């Protein structure tokens, strides 16, 4: 529940990144960064500082899961929380996310009120 | 207050117009026989972005139209599909139609049904043609329906009960809500703090374990009777 948590809003789409941003806003979150892909993100992540990957499932060069497995077979990034943002609540996504090691999932578009609740539980389970 | 979408639309409409203009220019600059990888990636990303926005706001016709184009652009960018002038012209026509669909939504109007059917039909025809007539040799020639029709119908009686012990305030409702995403719960005993329900067996024990594990832990989970 850090209203400053560094959200790597990994998504290749700007307006969404913007309302996500504005809702984070009406809810009080204002610290949001944008990335456009997995190599970019992996490159970006090969850097560091990222705490929450609000990663859209899909991107070019390397997607959400390769991102996630490479993330996982690699010594250094093996345990980052990745909130897979998904357009819809689906099981295999939910499970593959689970077997390759993902942290949680959410469905857009949400009201300020909903985004509000999901964040709460991951925070909960990871101990945040 | 009240997340109204009839203004989160304006930002989308503007982004979409811009992405449609970019799509058009990239398409016009593409060299079919040797498409610049970076240019195709941009066309694909514009389409992916427009599709997600269309899904978020329930713009059915635009979403499906963009969906079909995106899959095609993915094939071409991965190098699985060859491009030519006809295909590029179809993409341009697709961009033209998507713009008309967007312009209808801007006016709180419904897009053109006939143009929608025509473009989707053409896009699906191309994908089909991009296939060389089904896969090589017969596939799924057996792996399909395996084990014949089970004896009773769905497990004789070994659903295994899942016992979720130790849940929180609103978690009863919520986990009820979450297990409700993976599987279906019956005999929902909503105790003050518990949730028991019988379990179907539709997911490897090893995997149910894995997802509940997004909200709860491996030992909170017992499989027995």
PDB file of C-alpha atoms in Angstrom, chain A residues 11-16 18-19 23 26 36-37 56 58-63 82 89-99 101-105 108-113 118 121-122 124-125, chain B residues 1-3 5 8 11-12 14-16 19 41 44-45 48-53 55-57 77-78 168-171 174 178 181-182 202-203 206-208 210-218:
ATOM      1  CA  UNK A  11       1.995  -2.135 -21.868  1.00  0.00           C
ATOM      2  CA  UNK A  12       2.475  -1.028 -25.259  1.00  0.00           C
ATOM      3  CA  UNK A  13      -0.864   1.281 -25.143  1.00  0.00           C
ATOM      4  CA  UNK A  14      -0.711   4.974 -23.994  1.00  0.00           C
ATOM      5  CA  UNK A  15      -4.325   6.053 -23.087  1.00  0.00           C
ATOM      6  CA  UNK A  16      -4.776   2.959 -20.918  1.00  0.00           C
ATOM      7  CA  UNK A  18      -3.262   7.100 -18.864  1.00  0.00           C
ATOM      8  CA  UNK A  19      -6.507   6.110 -17.269  1.00  0.00           C
ATOM      9  CA  UNK A  23      -7.645   5.911 -11.628  1.00  0.00           C
ATOM     10  CA  UNK A  26      -8.564   9.239  -8.068  1.00  0.00           C
ATOM     11  CA  UNK A  36       6.555  -0.969 -24.085  1.00  0.00           C
ATOM     12  CA  UNK A  37       7.957  -4.673 -24.081  1.00  0.00           C
ATOM     13  CA  UNK A  56       0.236  -6.622 -19.584  1.00  0.00           C
ATOM     14  CA  UNK A  58       1.391  -9.347 -24.284  1.00  0.00           C
ATOM     15  CA  UNK A  59       4.350  -7.590 -25.825  1.00  0.00           C
ATOM     16  CA  UNK A  60       6.951  -7.929 -28.580  1.00  0.00           C
ATOM     17  CA  UNK A  61      10.612  -9.444 -28.417  1.00  0.00           C
ATOM     18  CA  UNK A  62       9.798 -11.292 -25.280  1.00  0.00           C
ATOM     19  CA  UNK A  63       6.366 -11.518 -23.702  1.00  0.00           C
ATOM     20  CA  UNK A  82       4.279  -9.652 -11.569  1.00  0.00           C
ATOM     21  CA  UNK A  89     -10.075 -13.672 -15.738  1.00  0.00           C
ATOM     22  CA  UNK A  90      -8.844 -16.942 -17.393  1.00  0.00           C
ATOM     23  CA  UNK A  91      -7.656 -20.173 -15.675  1.00  0.00           C
ATOM     24  CA  UNK A  92      -4.579 -21.346 -17.736  1.00  0.00           C
ATOM     25  CA  UNK A  93      -3.274 -17.862 -17.748  1.00  0.00           C
ATOM     26  CA  UNK A  94      -3.960 -17.861 -14.153  1.00  0.00           C
ATOM     27  CA  UNK A  95      -2.171 -21.315 -13.829  1.00  0.00           C
ATOM     28  CA  UNK A  96       0.661 -20.948 -16.249  1.00  0.00           C
ATOM     29  CA  UNK A  97       1.179 -17.749 -14.440  1.00  0.00           C
ATOM     30  CA  UNK A  98       1.190 -19.913 -11.394  1.00  0.00           C
ATOM     31  CA  UNK A  99       3.603 -22.762 -12.645  1.00  0.00           C
ATOM     32  CA  UNK A 101       5.909 -18.410 -10.937  1.00  0.00           C
ATOM     33  CA  UNK A 102       3.468 -15.247 -11.366  1.00  0.00           C
ATOM     34  CA  UNK A 103       2.084 -13.200  -8.395  1.00  0.00           C
ATOM     35  CA  UNK A 104      -1.489 -12.286  -9.219  1.00  0.00           C
ATOM     36  CA  UNK A 105      -3.891 -10.978 -11.824  1.00  0.00           C
ATOM     37  CA  UNK A 108      -9.446  -3.852 -16.833  1.00  0.00           C
ATOM     38  CA  UNK A 109     -11.247  -1.562 -16.863  1.00  0.00           C
ATOM     39  CA  UNK A 110     -11.818  -1.159 -13.308  1.00  0.00           C
ATOM     40  CA  UNK A 111     -13.211   1.689 -11.259  1.00  0.00           C
ATOM     41  CA  UNK A 112     -11.141   3.339  -8.877  1.00  0.00           C
ATOM     42  CA  UNK A 113     -12.973   1.249  -6.335  1.00  0.00           C
ATOM     43  CA  UNK A 118      -6.959  -6.322  -6.072  1.00  0.00           C
ATOM     44  CA  UNK A 121      -4.715  -8.926  -1.758  1.00  0.00           C
ATOM     45  CA  UNK A 122      -1.294  -9.289  -3.559  1.00  0.00           C
ATOM     46  CA  UNK A 124      -1.564  -9.271   1.330  1.00  0.00           C
ATOM     47  CA  UNK A 125      -0.067 -12.629   0.065  1.00  0.00           C
TER      48      UNK A 125
ATOM     49  CA  UNK B   1     -16.748   9.150  -8.192  1.00  0.00           C
ATOM     50  CA  UNK B   2     -18.581   6.568 -10.336  1.00  0.00           C
ATOM     51  CA  UNK B   3     -16.095   5.402 -12.987  1.00  0.00           C
ATOM     52  CA  UNK B   5     -16.468   5.476 -19.350  1.00  0.00           C
ATOM     53  CA  UNK B   8     -12.591   7.633 -20.614  1.00  0.00           C
ATOM     54  CA  UNK B  11      -8.634   9.820 -24.707  1.00  0.00           C
ATOM     55  CA  UNK B  12      -9.110   6.488 -26.476  1.00  0.00           C
ATOM     56  CA  UNK B  14      -7.763  10.453 -29.897  1.00  0.00           C
ATOM     57  CA  UNK B  15      -5.148   7.725 -29.344  1.00  0.00           C
ATOM     58  CA  UNK B  16      -6.915   5.489 -31.890  1.00  0.00           C
ATOM     59  CA  UNK B  19      -2.542   5.106 -34.212  1.00  0.00           C
ATOM     60  CA  UNK B  41       6.212  -4.222 -35.363  1.00  0.00           C
ATOM     61  CA  UNK B  44       1.157  -4.672 -35.042  1.00  0.00           C
ATOM     62  CA  UNK B  45       1.528  -2.592 -31.863  1.00  0.00           C
ATOM     63  CA  UNK B  48      -2.810  -4.429 -30.449  1.00  0.00           C
ATOM     64  CA  UNK B  49      -3.339  -1.094 -28.665  1.00  0.00           C
ATOM     65  CA  UNK B  50      -6.548  -0.286 -30.492  1.00  0.00           C
ATOM     66  CA  UNK B  51      -7.874  -3.799 -29.797  1.00  0.00           C
ATOM     67  CA  UNK B  52      -7.330  -3.557 -26.054  1.00  0.00           C
ATOM     68  CA  UNK B  53      -9.051  -0.194 -25.895  1.00  0.00           C
ATOM     69  CA  UNK B  55     -12.250  -4.515 -25.527  1.00  0.00           C
ATOM     70  CA  UNK B  56     -12.097  -2.311 -22.437  1.00  0.00           C
ATOM     71  CA  UNK B  57     -14.986  -0.161 -23.672  1.00  0.00           C
ATOM     72  CA  UNK B  77       5.964 -10.010 -38.325  1.00  0.00           C
ATOM     73  CA  UNK B  78       6.994 -13.454 -37.051  1.00  0.00           C
ATOM     74  CA  UNK B 168     -10.759 -13.854   6.299  1.00  0.00           C
ATOM     75  CA  UNK B 169     -13.515 -11.220   6.479  1.00  0.00           C
ATOM     76  CA  UNK B 170     -14.843 -10.713   3.038  1.00  0.00           C
ATOM     77  CA  UNK B 171     -12.443 -13.570   1.989  1.00  0.00           C
ATOM     78  CA  UNK B 174     -13.991 -13.259  -2.224  1.00  0.00           C
ATOM     79  CA  UNK B 178     -11.828 -16.632  -6.647  1.00  0.00           C
ATOM     80  CA  UNK B 181     -12.808 -18.319 -11.336  1.00  0.00           C
ATOM     81  CA  UNK B 182     -10.842 -21.701 -11.433  1.00  0.00           C
ATOM     82  CA  UNK B 202     -10.621 -30.791 -12.957  1.00  0.00           C
ATOM     83  CA  UNK B 203      -7.281 -29.548 -12.119  1.00  0.00           C
ATOM     84  CA  UNK B 206      -0.477 -29.968  -8.220  1.00  0.00           C
ATOM     85  CA  UNK B 207      -2.089 -27.023 -10.127  1.00  0.00           C
ATOM     86  CA  UNK B 208      -5.051 -26.034  -7.887  1.00  0.00           C
ATOM     87  CA  UNK B 210      -0.548 -23.648  -7.580  1.00  0.00           C
ATOM     88  CA  UNK B 211      -3.338 -20.936  -8.050  1.00  0.00           C
ATOM     89  CA  UNK B 212      -5.090 -20.757  -4.757  1.00  0.00           C
ATOM     90  CA  UNK B 213      -1.567 -20.322  -3.868  1.00  0.00           C
ATOM     91  CA  UNK B 214      -2.079 -16.759  -5.297  1.00  0.00           C
ATOM     92  CA  UNK B 215      -4.256 -15.914  -2.291  1.00  0.00           C
ATOM     93  CA  UNK B 216      -3.648 -18.823   0.130  1.00  0.00           C
ATOM     94  CA  UNK B 217      -0.936 -21.600   0.894  1.00  0.00           C
ATOM     95  CA  UNK B 218      -0.165 -25.372   0.158  1.00  0.00           C
TER      96      UNK B 218
END
